[PDB]
Amino acid sequence: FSRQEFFQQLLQGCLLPTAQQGLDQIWLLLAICLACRLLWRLGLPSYLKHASTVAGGFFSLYHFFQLHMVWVVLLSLLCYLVLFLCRHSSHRGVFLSVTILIYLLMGEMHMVDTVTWHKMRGAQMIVAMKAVSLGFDLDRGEVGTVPSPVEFMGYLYFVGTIVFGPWISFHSYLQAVQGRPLSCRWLQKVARSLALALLCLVLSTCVGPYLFPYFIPLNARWLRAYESAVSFHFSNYFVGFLSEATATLAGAGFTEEKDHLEWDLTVSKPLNVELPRSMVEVVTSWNLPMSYWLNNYVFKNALRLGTFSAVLVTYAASALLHGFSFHLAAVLLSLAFITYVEHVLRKRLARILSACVLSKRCPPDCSHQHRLGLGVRALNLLFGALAIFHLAYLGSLFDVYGMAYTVHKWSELSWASHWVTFGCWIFYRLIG
């Protein structure tokens, strides 16, 4: 049906039902988060606050996942065991990481109920990303005492970051248990993040998939790829801004410097991906808490294996946390080559031309000659175009399916990115 007949029913078929479902899904999680935020302001003993958030986490998990929340609860218990047995050693990170690895593998063998296991990962993952975190923050000395059972449980089951919420370090949660005054910036941040989450949801559901035929007079295999990539990006940004809102509602996600308290828990920066500078900025700004967790607790450890062999292990860990699907695993493996080759090639180009063409906008104290020349703008724009093209290629797998689906979807595109990356690596090794 034509554009007019589409827009005549757009609002009644897309704008109201999508937002209705988006609000019906979270009207209870937001209520529980607000109840926790208000309850943690009565000057209660800390153990009672941790017990309250444990109860809230149980109730929230039960409300989302009917009774399969055991596959999370169990994990939590298991984690604490591996934290209490090796509490004295300096291997806490390694033991907790091996436990998480064994648990996720034993889960991905598709023995236990998979219809609901494959939809709890978004929560289960977080728990893992928390436990391992502590296991290393105690080793390097960034956390003093091994927490008591109630503190650890109230950390894993933090009602703000249990369902969608991002990973937050143990100290960034302890400083939330103390609680901060209900300022106006707090409500402002919560409302802004909720509005942006709803906007990204309604913009991903059916303004994305119907982008180029109707919203554009253009219309193929590349246009569908780009619209699928945009739909996927915004379907993520929904969860991102919603997690940011639920974590700023429960009290967490705030920095303080020179008695200045600011709520700036950023999870996803959409303007660094839709108008990208480089694929490194796309990856590290697709999910900021996870992009910091992986760089700090996986890459920095496996760095002994060599730079590339550590980047690849980091992407393997990221493809294991998200849940192993062949399209997602292929994307998160190709991203390793793409990002590494682009980074090192831009590095060589900047060292040769003495220009500011690094994969990140340099600091003001760089030793480059061409800081703002038109050639620098042209190179940055060409690499941004390559980044948009890599995104439109990779995100084509997430339309709305094992090796056959991926091979077919990438054969319709004639393997454009996997040849552009090879060409860029050849170009890098030739001008070496």
């Epitope: 800390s46 509490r87 390097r140 000395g141 003093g144 005492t145 091994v146 302890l174």
Partner: antibody, heavy 119, light 107 residues
Framework: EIQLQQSGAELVKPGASVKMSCKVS????????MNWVKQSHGKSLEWIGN????????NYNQKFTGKATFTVDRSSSTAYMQLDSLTSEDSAVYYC????????????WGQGTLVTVSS | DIHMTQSPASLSAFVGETVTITCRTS??????LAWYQQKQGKSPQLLVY???TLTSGVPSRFSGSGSGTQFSLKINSLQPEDFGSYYC?????????FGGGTKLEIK
């Protein structure tokens, strides 16, 4: 019995570098963190930093970064700290201390080396 | 950085009295705080950790208590070998900072 033997006193010219040594004996060296602490004369203690002997990642105090570097020797179970560009403000006693394990309190202390900077 | 103040800077009592040293923390540490004792010319020794738990081999007269931003060590029935500097040191997270140091002296 746990014993953290330490090097002898040092007298260094201003601007030079010094390298201490804390030899551990009494437990598995790669089991617990090793903190380095500085105490002036008649003053309070200051936490220079720590090193994890299992994986050699370190953790410095921001006031002592770039001035003290930590290294380890697992074969002889010895933790070294190197102070660079010493001034007259670094004449103090330096202790090594094994973390308690569960908590990060300094359970077993060394004996300290007196580092004096003069001409 | 967490600023730890400690009071009093220097006190003096007879043998067999009861003394209370206080440590006030700028930020809020939940219960993470240790008390070390250092005699004249020796390395410190861990006396109390978690602000109440006594270490292995310490007499039962050292009784530390408190929580939040106000902790206190209580030395009752003072003994001759209990004279020296006492440092409070939080262990809530790097970087750990020590207190000023109360110097218990003879009287």
């Amino acid at each position: 019995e746990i014993q953290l033997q330490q090097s002898g006193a040092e007298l260094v010219k201003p601007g030079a570098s010094v390298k201490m040594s804390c030899k551990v004996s009494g437990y598995s060296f790669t089991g617990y963190n090793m903190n380095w602490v500085k105490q002036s004369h008649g003053k309070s203690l200051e936490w220079i930093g720590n090193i994890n002997p299992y994986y050699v990642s370190t953790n410095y105090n921001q006031k002592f970064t770039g001035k003290a570097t930590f290294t380890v020797d697992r074969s002889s179970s010895t933790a070294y700290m190197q102070l660079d560009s010493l001034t007259s403000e670094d004449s103090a006693v330096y202790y090594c201390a094994r973390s308690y394990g569960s908590s990060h309190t300094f359970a077993y202390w060394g004996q300290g080396t007196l580092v004096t900077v003069s001409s | 950085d967490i600023h730890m103040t400690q009071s009093p800077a220097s006190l003096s009592a007879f043998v067999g009295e009861t003394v209370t040293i206080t440590c006030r923390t700028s930020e809020n540490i939940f219960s993470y705080l240790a008390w070390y004792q250092q005699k004249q010319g020796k390395s410190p020794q861990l006396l109390v950790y978690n602000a109440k738990t006594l270490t292995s081999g310490v007499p039962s007269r050292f009784s530390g208590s408190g929580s939040g931003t106000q902790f206190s060590l209580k030395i009752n029935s003072l003994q001759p070998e209990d004279f020296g500097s006492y440092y409070c040191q939080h262990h809530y997270g790097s970087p750990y900072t020590f207190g000023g140091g109360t110097k218990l002296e003879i009287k």
